[PDB]
């Protein structure tokens, strides 16, 4: 849970939230929201897929307006 320039890493906070959950929650689910939070920090998969959908719909509209 370190960082490339010290400073608590990027989401050692999200991992602490996902570990405190997995500490005192008896199931792997009901602690999965925090797991998806932490993996979102790691790979930015949700953020990148949303940005790409934004840009994709924009590009489709622009191409439909350009070529028609």
């Amino acid at each position: 849970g370190w960082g490339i320039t010290g400073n608590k890493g990027r989401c050692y906070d999200f991992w602490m939230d996902f570990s405190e959950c997995m500490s005192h929650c008896r199931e792997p689910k009901d602690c999965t929201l925090l797991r998806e939070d932490y993996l979102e920090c790691l790979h930015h998969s949700k953020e990148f897929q949303r940005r790409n959908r934004i840009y994709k719909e924009e590009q489709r509209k622009l191409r439909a307006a350009s070529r028609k």
Partner: protein, 46 residues
């Protein structure tokens, strides 16, 4: 006869508790049928 054949047979006697033996054997194996189904469940232990 020959002076001891009478007590020569009391080298075993009924003592019928060997059926409670299997009675509690069965408790053993009823629990043991949970040998392979159990696995990791604890994420709250150390």
């Amino acid at each position: 006869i020959m002076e001891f054949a009478e007590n020569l047979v009391l080298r075993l006697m009924e003592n019928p508790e060997e059926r409670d033996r299997k009675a509690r054997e069965h408790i053993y194996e009823m629990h043991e049928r949970c040998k392979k189904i159990k696995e990791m469940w604890a994420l709250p232990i150390r």
